[PDB]
Design a protein around this ligand. Structure first.
Ligand SMILES: [Ca+2]
Ligand SMILES: [Ca+2]
Length: 281
């Protein structure tokens, strides 16, 4: 049975339907096919890793993030470019402690998700914590919270009863975020309601690094490797991220549905991407 341990939830072994058939999904994202996947029991963080947690890691180890080694990271234009996504600016000195670059800080965001962390940085933290990154299937089973093929962690309605359940964009992207959900940037890792397994902000807030190499179609075939504790392709060039972010909106990406997925190279980082850890029982 489901139980809690520290700030993690112990998800029992089980079977669920992964993926989606949203009619507007981008073919290259490989959200389909919908497929039945059986997982062994695992533990997963109920919260994405926070600024204060990452700061404790850096204080204990002296870890220097990829964004600090490169000297820049990606910041959203409005908080002071990639041709296909011109709202993303490469900002020298943007990093986890200064998420909008020079002049910014995290003093007023101690319990927000840490951002500007690459996949390498996430793995470094997880390893120091005695943990690991979730597989994409573990992430999605946990984020679905026991519901079968719902659009979002809590069901099919984005705002049940008109109440916000996650931190995404409202308004007109990218020129005006109305902040109707309470936040025009990240929110605390423990904001909004939990899902059915106790996880917070699986949808929205920040994209979350997973263990798997990205593919659009490795998982399309039916086989034990793709359906029983699937770990993704053996190689790749980008790692999977899940969940969507405070910037996501139906008018451009529509990537805050639980089946959604994207990827980034493992040394890359951005103001809307963090991670949560997992562990084996
Ligand atoms: Ca928001
Ligand atoms: Ca998320």
């Amino acid at each position: 049975n489901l139980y809690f341990q520290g700030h993690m939830v112990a998800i029992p072994g089980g079977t669920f339907r992964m993926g989606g058939e949203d009619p507007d999904a981008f073919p290259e994202d490989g959200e389909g096919p919908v497929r039945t996947v059986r997982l062994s029991p695992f533990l997963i963080d109920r919260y994405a890793v926070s600024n204060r947690q990452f700061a404790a890691f850096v204080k204990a180890t002296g870890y220097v993030t990829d964004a600090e080694r490169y000297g820049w990271s990606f910041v959203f234009h409005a908080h002071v470019v990639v041709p296909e996504a011109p709202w993303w600016v490469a900002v020298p000195g943007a990093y986890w402690k200064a998420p909008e670059g020079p002049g910014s800080s995290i003093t007023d965001r101690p319990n927000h998700p840490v951002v500007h962390v690459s996949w390498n940085d996430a793995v470094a933290y997880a390893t120091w914590a005695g943990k690991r990154l979730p597989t994409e299937a573990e992430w999605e089973m946990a984020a679905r919270g026991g519901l079968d093929q719902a659009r979002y962690p809590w069901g099919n309605e984005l705002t049940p009863r008109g109440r916000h359940r996650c931190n995404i964009w409202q308004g007109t992207f990218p020129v005006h975020d109305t902040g109707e959900d309470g936040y025009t940037g990240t929110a605390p890792v423990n904001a909004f309601a939990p899902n059915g397994y106790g996880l917070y902000n699986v949808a929205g807030n920040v994209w979350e690094w997973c263990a798997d190499w990205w593919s659009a179609d490795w998982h399309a075939t039916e086989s034990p490797a793709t359906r029983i504790d699937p770990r993704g392709p053996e190689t790749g060039t980008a790692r999977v991220t899940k969940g969507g972010s405070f910037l996501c909106h139906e008018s451009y990406c529509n990537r805050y549905r639980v089946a959604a997925r994207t990827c980034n190279t493992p040394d890359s980082s951005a103001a809307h991407t963090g991670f949560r850890c997992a562990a084996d029982p």
